[PDB]
Design a protein around this ligand. Structure first.
Ligand SMILES: *[C@@H]1O[C@H](CO)[C@@H](O[C@@H]2O[C@H](CO)[C@@H](O)[C@H](O)[C@H]2NC(C)=O)[C@H](O)[C@H]1NC(C)=O
Ligand SMILES: *[C@@H]1O[C@H](CO)[C@@H](O[C@@H]2O[C@H](CO)[C@@H](O)[C@H](O)[C@H]2NC(C)=O)[C@H](O)[C@H]1NC(C)=O
Ligand SMILES: *[C@@H]1O[C@H](CO)[C@@H](O[C@@H]2O[C@H](CO)[C@@H](O)[C@H](O)[C@H]2NC(C)=O)[C@H](O)[C@H]1NC(C)=O
Ligand SMILES: *[C@@H]1O[C@H](CO)[C@@H](O[C@@H]2O[C@H](CO)[C@@H](O)[C@H](O)[C@H]2NC(C)=O)[C@H](O)[C@H]1NC(C)=O
Ligand SMILES: *[C@@H]1O[C@H](CO)[C@@H](O[C@@H]2O[C@H](CO)[C@@H](O)[C@H](O)[C@H]2NC(C)=O)[C@H](O)[C@H]1NC(C)=O
Ligand SMILES: *[C@@H]1O[C@H](CO)[C@@H](O[C@@H]2O[C@H](CO)[C@@H](O)[C@H](O)[C@H]2NC(C)=O)[C@H](O)[C@H]1NC(C)=O
Lengths: 158, 336, 158, 158, 336, 336
């Protein structure tokens, strides 16, 4: 589903084979979320705020060793935190793929009308041919069931 | 027809480690780590790296600038970082000083760790306040100033008074004389010479006792007279004697005491050091080199990614952080 | 949708205009989750457990400076961690808004019966007028489709 | 629902009372996710990477105290981070229960065909008897509505 | 009709920074930061802040309490925190001590950093164990006790024996004599006087050598005889001599050695210090002031929020943590 | 019929703390913490724990190995960790050394903190370079080697020259002589004896002055002649004199100066120490004991869980981390 251009999209498989169209807005949204997550990892290299008097070298060894120990503990804890944040961000980025597909499913749920059969996998069955023009209208948000002879939702007026 | 929503497949190109999904194959990923490439030392784009203490005063070393040598009294630029290019800075001007018999060898490596290095006009302890009232500061003869005129260290006064002979000892108190956010750096010492010469100048033939007590603790020396180390680190060709120095540091509200017998050379001027700056070890700067970060192992480096995988060391500026392994970030869909 | 009293709620838009009612249980749940998240941020100021001999002032400068460096590194790392927890908790609080709306959607999915048309946006169409009393019954969980002449779910007995 | 063997599963309640079957694949997935989460908590005890010259005991008290302070700050910050990861991982493990049930709901949504009534709670009503064999076919993924006289989804060919 | 589930809109009032959503406009937010307002120093609600070492013994300074002055031997309350109100605590009672020529000026600032400060009965090294057997502790005459009777420092013994004249030197070993969780603080020193007076009392006219070796390192002094600093920090109007002191600290299992010639003033009593407590610099306590936290920049402060945005410094008690920027937390729906 | 998807109930057995759900009752949980049980000290599975410096050389202490005693010159195994079983390591062989009057008492506790302890062949400062040219190293007579032959300390040369009588003093410079990643450890000192014996051997009757200046700072001693502490820590039954030692440490690129008068005992050999290793305090190893972790409070311990709830202390090896409270992890469904 997709990569006509863009990670996210829609497809129509039927008498005409498989046609594909892509949603470049959800794809851009996913790329922006990934960029923002990377942009929140770039701040862990800027955690030095205070500047204290430094300890000079060529002094008592025990003092040199304490200064080195402070720097080595800070560096090891920072590296461990970076590794855990990378693992967590990769997990969140992968989970976002399913969140984005769910949103696309709900978009089809509304646009295709009450007569579309929801198969549970994010696929719907409609009693009409859907060949390219239909996928463009789905991507653009202009699909209207009545154009194809499909039932629309009942109005709230009764 | 069947209208589906989802994501598209593609060939996997990277594997990403996750918390619960294992190594997930993805179609693209961003490499968050790089291996640094060593470069020359230089500035950091954001400001001056001090390198030499007084880059516009030629013919002088940093040890000579720190001692306020008569011909080395130039302008010290401000810097945002500094490089320690000398582990044992050497003196080349004035009377020989036994820098390896005290704690003054690292003085230039103290001044450089601050953003602003200021010479403070005025003697740390005025001549009029010494116990043997008509105290004068004598010219050395091995400290010529510009025109060949005999002079003296700006920071160190070779003091003599109205009398000669052994004394009980004198005591002086030196108080902080910089601003509230400045640290004061003092230099004081003792003249050691042959017993015949110590008798001629001060009226004593035996070693004299010098004591100081500063926040750093108590210091005591009794310089031996004669059998001096071979003459070095001086403009003198014949010195006969040697200077023994002690470096003292005071912060706001602090005091120190110097108990001294004959042969004492007193503070003549002092340094006031303001905002601390990062310091790394390394080579002097390459003329015209600019980088984002100065690393101790790698010289100037760029930061193409926020993290690096290489040798750990200290770094100053817009530096990447060290990590142990390559780190990839998902920038695509999960692979089929 | 809501704030008759409370962030979360239901509305009915039709021949009678728009009527609103609110669910104070889901709203209280959201408020309690926010309070608990804040209550887990108040613990990052209490991470000092051990008391060691302190380093006194008016001592050797290098030792005083190492003590100061330890305090400054700890303070800078703590401030950076606080900033990241605030950003993460704000993201989680915002996402919870959609989790709560989804739960409300499923409550309507069950209460409105098999004949309600699910529009995908958390809105359902029912073939009756729903004027205030119906929203109170929905909020209270006592809505029964048969009260309005609507089909109920088929029993499991067959 | 479940524990015939395994945390996750399906049940059928009707004229024959309540029958239960369990899905050991989703259950194993949950168990593996829990194990992996524990396996990512086991790495914070291995964050010492550098070995520096140690400070010996029986030395100047201020130096001994700074070395002790460094060790005590590191230990207190590590303990606080461990406590927060345990709280966060327990929250994520509990939330996974709903993610797994949702996946099971979608599995039934597809397998039971377009005529099943979706009650919103992950329960569906079908016009046939489902007595053990039907639950085994559901767990194994081989349920076919026509076997019981129920409608399947319309094909995409038209 | 159309029945919808969702959330209600309202006007935005705050914007909250997020990981991936940017600055999200929300209808309400909680401010997690505050700017501290300076208050007086006082107690911390949870317990006593030491301030003065002996608040019920009037007429004495903390240096006089720490030195166990005959009239300053009061009760030291326990505290959960302390304030360093004196950077150079002064002596006002007994014989003059040259506190700026040693490491004893900060003694009152060591005792205060522990919760329990206990005077330990008994001489750290008993009089019967000294090499010149009939050793006695002489009254000073410038240490009057209550009734005008001549006395001595509780912690320091002015020792004389059966002989006079120069000696090779004597060596004593001092072992830890507190409980396993207590640190022992000793005071010892040397009497310096005019050479005529040193001859009259001890039979010597020249400076004598004193040496100690404790875990803190080696210490050595040879006090000058005469030309003393102007008399100060004493109840004496005429002293002639001066006392040179050294502070020694031992932990459990530790030992120290004191090599001493004539003029040695020995340990007379010692402090045992138990559980450490936080210490901040600041003004003395205001009578009746209570706060949640003592900050170094701000005096007593409240903690209306867990974090603050202001000047960084040390703090003791139920204190907020410093952050760099205002922090808002969502407490409402996302704005329309 | 009605076909439902969900999870099954069961009885709750554990309650788990969460971020927003409070204490959630669950049917099962994993206990991530344990209470350690004290065991014997031993090795760590991954390698040797040093314990004794030279376990195959019987009859010697670690101080005798560190001083390179003639009969204690064995093989030092490499180790990944070490145990400090002696707080005041004692000497049992050779001439008595006043280890409590200097900084050499902890020498064995310095060597053990490195993985590789290497004896460096060659004198740190060669005999041919001393000012009084025909310098020899004398046998002691209280250092017998194997066959009863008089010998000397491997690390310390009892030096005499061609003359006797007081001198001005001599100065030597010692440079680093190990590899770039090794730290060099020196021992030097002074012979103190009765003034009659110091006159017989060196031509002097008064205390002599010794000075050193290394990165650790300045050291000065003037050993008293006579009235020595009771003879101990020696194979000698009568010694008359005593040795005063100083321990010096140099890293790559560093130098130190030793100014010395008569009675000086020079460096004879030195230690080169490579990769640092963790060190804990504790009892010597139990023969045959193996554990995953050496803790200071608990001896060898296992790591059945990643975290423990007990007394905090240092630890070496595959150790659990200390936490404040029991920690449970969900391993089941929510309880009904
Ligand atoms: C993830 O990959 C996409 C490519 O699929 C990156 O987007 C491209 O970025 C370059 C700039 O380096 C642009 O010239 C292209 O036009 C972008 N492509 C599209 C389709 O927008 C994206 O930047 C990558 N993510 C990150 C964080 O770098
Ligand atoms: C991501 O970047 C890292 C660091 O540059 C790469 O790892 C290095 O790869 C080079 C070969 O090009 C090796 O010589 C280095 O030794 C590697 N470093 C480490 C720490 O292993 C890594 O291969 C890159 N990965 C991708 C997919 O680009
Ligand atoms: C978030 O805002 C709500 C207000 O909408 C706060 O709830 C109110 O709290 C006050 C006490 O300060 C009570 O007197 C009100 O009755 C509460 N209102 C409701 C509707 O319950 C809530 O406390 C805020 N969140 C936090 C963490 O303080
Ligand atoms: C969570 O509990 C399950 C039991 O329900 C553990 O799985 C069992 O592990 C033992 C080994 O200790 C095996 O012999 C059993 O066969 C396992 N049972 C099943 C059904 O697979 C599981 O290991 C626990 N989780 C963790 C992280 O320990
Ligand atoms: C949240 O609190 C912070 C801290 O009190 C506020 O920032 C301060 O606002 C005052 C004006 O009232 C300024 O004088 C300070 O300089 C500000 N501090 C900083 C660090 O910027 C902030 O305005 C508050 N925000 C809200 C929405 O209440
Ligand atoms: C989880 O493990 C901890 C640590 O072993 C248990 O807490 C200890 O329990 C023993 C009794 O068996 C007490 O004597 C200790 O004092 C407890 N330690 C602490 C720090 O409280 C805890 O009970 C275990 N919990 C479960 C459910 O197994």
């Amino acid at each position: 589903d997709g990569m006509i251009a863009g990670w996210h999209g829609y497809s129509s498989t039927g008498d005409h084979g498989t046609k594909v169209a892509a949603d470049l807005v959800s794809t851009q949204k996913a790329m922006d979320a990934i960029t923002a997550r990377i942009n929140n990892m770039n701040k862990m290299t800027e955690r030095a705020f205070s500047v204290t008097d430094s300890t000079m070298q060529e002094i008592q060894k025990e003092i040199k060793d304490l200064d080195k120990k402070i720097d080595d503990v800070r560096a090891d804890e920072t590296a461990a935190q970076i590794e855990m944040i990378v693992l967590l961000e990769n997990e969140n980025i992968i989970n976002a793929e399913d969140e984005h597909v769910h949103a696309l499913k709900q978009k089809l749920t509304k646009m295709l009308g009450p007569s579309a059969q929801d198969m549970g996998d994010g696929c719907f069955i409609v009693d009409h041919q859907c060949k390219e023009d239909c996928l463009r209208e789905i991507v653009s948000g202009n699909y209207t069931p009545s154009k194809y002879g499909m039932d629309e939702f009942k109005s709230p007026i009764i | 027809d069947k209208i589906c929503a989802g994501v598209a497949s593609g060939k996997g190109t990277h594997r990403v480690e996750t918390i619960t999904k294992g190594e997930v194959l993805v179609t693209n990923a961003i490499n968050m780590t790089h291996t640094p490439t060593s470069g020359p030392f230089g500035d950091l784009k954001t400001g001056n790296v001090r390198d030499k203490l007084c880059p516009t005063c030629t013919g002088c070393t940093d040890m000579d600038v720190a001692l306020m040598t008569p011909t080395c009294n130039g302008v010290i630029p401000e810097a945002i970082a500094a490089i320690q290019h000398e582990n044992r800075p050497l003196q080349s001007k004035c009377n020989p000083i036994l820098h390896d018999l005290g704690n003054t060898r690292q003085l230039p490596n103290l001044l450089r760790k601050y953003k602003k290095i200021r010479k403070s006009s005025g003697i740390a302890f005025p001549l009029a306040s010494y116990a043997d009232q008509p105290v004068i500061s004598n010219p050395s003869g091995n400290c010529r100033d510009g025109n060949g005129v005999e002079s003296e260290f700006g920071s160190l006064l070779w003091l003599t008074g109205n009398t000669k002979g052994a004394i009980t000892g004198e005591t002086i108190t030196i108080t902080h004389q910089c601003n509230n956010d400045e640290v004061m750096v003092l230099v004081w010492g003792a003249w050691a010479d042959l017993s015949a010469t110590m008798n001629t100048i001060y009226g004593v033939t035996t070693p004299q006792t010098y004591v100081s007590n500063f926040p750093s603790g108590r210091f005591s020396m009794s310089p031996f007279l004669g059998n001096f180390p071979a003459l070095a680190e001086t403009e003198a060709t014949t010195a006969t004697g040697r200077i023994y120095l002690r470096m003292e540091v005071l912060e706001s509200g602090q005091r120190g005491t110097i108990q001294y017998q004959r042969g004492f050379m007193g503070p003549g001027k002092f340094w006031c050091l303001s905002e601390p700056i990062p310091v790394v070890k390394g080579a002097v700067k390459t003329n015209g080199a600019v980088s984002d970060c100065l690393h101790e192992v790698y010289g100037g480096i760029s930061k193409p990614t926020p993290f690096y995988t290489g040798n750990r060391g200290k770094s100053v500026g817009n530096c990447p952080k060290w990590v142990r392994k390559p780190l990839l970030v998902v920038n695509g869909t999960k692979a089929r």
